[PDB]
Amino acid sequence: VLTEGNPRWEQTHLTYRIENYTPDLPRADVDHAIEKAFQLWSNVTPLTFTKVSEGQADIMISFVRGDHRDNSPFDGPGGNLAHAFQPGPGIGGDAHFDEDERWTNNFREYNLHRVAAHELGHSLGLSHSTDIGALMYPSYTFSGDVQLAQDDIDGIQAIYGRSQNPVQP
Ligand SMILES: COc1ccc(S(=O)(=O)N(Cc2cccnc2)[C@@H](C(=O)NO)C(C)C)cc1
Ligand SMILES: [Ca+2]
Numbered sequence: 001v002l003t004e005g006n007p008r009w010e011q012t013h014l015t016y017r018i019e020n021y022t023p024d025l026p027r028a029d030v031d032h033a034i035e036k037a038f039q040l041w042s043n044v045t046p047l048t049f050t051k052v053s054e055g056q057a058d059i060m061i062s063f064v065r066g067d068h069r070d071n072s073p074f075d076g077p078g079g080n081l082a083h084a085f086q087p088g089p090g091i092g093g094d095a096h097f098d099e100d101e102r103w104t105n106n107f108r109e110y111n112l113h114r115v116a117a118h119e120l121g122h123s124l125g126l127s128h129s130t131d132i133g134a135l136m137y138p139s140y141t142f143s144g145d146v147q148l149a150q151d152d153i154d155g156i157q158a159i160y161g162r163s164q165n166p167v168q169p
């Protein structure tokens with residue numbers, strides 16, 4: 001409410017649910033990529049995530065093709081590779097992935113885990129940055145290893161706070 005059309009999550013815990021797995025890759029590989037991404041964000045923040053198989057989740061993930069009842073249809077391999085809505089009630093928090101391209105689990109054409117991590121940044125209220133090491137890169141590019149940069153760590157920690165509890169066990 002304080003922000004016009006871009007409210008932050010007032011909850012310290014969030015839930016998510018995958019509507020379906022793309023036939024390009026099984027669920028074991030996709031669950032790992034989605035689960036690994038949540039761990040990276042929780043590792044540096046006291047935030048906690050939990051997958052729900054029933055009820056509406058705060059962040060819904062689904063794959064779409066061509067027009068899917070939206071005002072931004074994909075135009076072939078060109079255009080954006082994925083998109084989402086600002087964090088808010090209703091369709092807000094939802095995130096769609098372009099299923100017209102083939103997803104891979106390596107440095108092949110595109111990295112699914114790298115894109116999922118970027119979509120979460122949008123759901124976490126993180127905007128694009130001009131830092132080369134920031135995963136929130138506007139266009140798609142090839143980065144070295146997948147790791148959070150100091151700018152991203154300070155940004156999410158600044159909004160909520162620092163994880164004053166680095167207990168691995
Ligand atoms: C790995 O991180 C990334 C995630 C998504 C993309 S994306 O090409 O789909 N894209 C960036 C874009 C494309 C074309 C022209 N202007 C801007 C969306 C975007 O920024 N998504 O986060 C946007 C246009 C909907 C790029 C990188
Ligand atoms: Ca495309």
Ligand SMILES: [Zn+2]
Binds near residue numbers: 064083096
């Ligand atoms: Zn969509």
Ligand SMILES: [Zn+2]
Binds near residue numbers: 118137
């Ligand atoms: Zn983006």
